[PDB]
Amino acid sequence: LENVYIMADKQKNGIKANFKIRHNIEDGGVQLAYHYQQNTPIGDGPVLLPDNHYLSTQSKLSKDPNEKRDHMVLLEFVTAAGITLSMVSKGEELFTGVVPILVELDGDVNGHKFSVSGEGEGDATYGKLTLKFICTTGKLPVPWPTLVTTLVQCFSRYPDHMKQHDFFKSAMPEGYIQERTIFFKDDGNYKTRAEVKFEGDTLVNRIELKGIDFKEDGNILGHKLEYNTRDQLTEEQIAEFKEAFSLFDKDGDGGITTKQLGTVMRSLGQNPTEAELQDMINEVGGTIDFPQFLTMMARKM
């Protein structure tokens, strides 16, 4: 669970953000990566600038065992948080259902050119992303976990009382421009610029990344970082919670009320004491998200 902290940028009519990514190093350790991010509308119409809040993000990286190319299967779930106790941009309509995503990245790290390409789907009301990524130029010269952040936060899931702080969807369909610098401790740094906008019926994220100053035998060019985490539920486990969870999602809004938790729990065969229910609620916590629910669950195994 990585946390993206977000602020408005009133002069630039957008937002910016900062966060830290713990990458597990091969046989012990954690390489850090420091993100600084700035987003600006592509279009002229007005956009929600938010209050200080943050996004709570869950990643899951797998491999397709029929793909002989170098690739990443990626599952992801995000929820806005912080702000306690709204509005709905006109753009938040485009996101109500299931929207297909396409991604395209060009990069030179340390003179090593390469191109990722990725397709999938987003389901904003669940905060869900599934996407598969191919490195179209050959062998990816940097580790895939290093490209996850670079590789669409408009698919985040803002609680009802926070729908008004969602800059990302408000900017749509015109889109926004995302720029980051990522600083790998005791090693080089990525520098990126992406346009994220609607093209036809598809959220399209075109990125150009530039990495300099990398130690050739470091952790990135050296490929010394873990791919999985295995601190993690499975695909077929998540799919069940999704299917149970959404059964009891009576409006399909992506939420379940809290009383409801136990019913959902029982439909999985599990049986929580009302002592056990009141805990889960408060640690994460009337409305519950799927990502939240997912984290609630995550703990208890």
Curated annotation (Swiss-Prot):
Effect of V78R: In Azurite; shifts the excitation and emission spectra to shorter wavelengths and increases quantum yields compared to BFP
Impact after mutating M7T: Increases fluorescence at warmer temperatures such as 37 degrees Celsius
Effect of F133L: In mut3.3; shifts fluorescence lifetime from 3.03 to 1.88 ns. In R10-3; matures to the red-emitting state with excitation and emission maxima at 555 and 585 nm, respectively
Usage in biotechnology: Green fluorescent protein has been engineered to produce a vast number of variously colored mutants, fusion proteins, and biosensors. Further generation of mutants led to more stable proteins (at 37 degrees Celsius for example) with brighter fluorescence and longer fluorescence lifetimes.
Known tissue expression: Photocytes.
Documented effect of changing T57I: Suppresses the 475 nm excitation peak, leaving only the shorter wavelength peak at 399 nm. In H9; increases fluorescence at 395 nm excitation
Annotated Pfam families: GFP (PF01353)
GO biological process: bioluminescence; generation of precursor metabolites and energy
Alphabetic keyword roster: Chromophore, Luminescence, Photoprotein
InterPro entries listed in its UniProt record: GFP (IPR009017), GFP-related (IPR011584), Green_fluorescent_prot (IPR000786)
SUPFAM superfamilies assigned to the protein according to its UniProt record, in alphabetical order: GFP-like
Resulting phenotype, S117R: In mut1.28; shifts fluorescence lifetime from 3.03 to 2.76 ns. In mut2.2; shifts fluorescence lifetime from 3.03 to 1.94 ns. In mut3.3; shifts fluorescence lifetime from 3.03 to 1.88 ns
Impact when changing T57 to H/W/F: Results in significantly red-shifted excitation and emission maxima
Variant or mutagenesis effect after changing Y126N: In EBFP1.2; shifts the excitation and emission spectra to shorter wavelengths and increases quantum yields compared to BFP
SUBUNIT field: Monomer.
Family: Belongs to the GFP family.
Name of the protein this chain belongs to: Green fluorescent protein
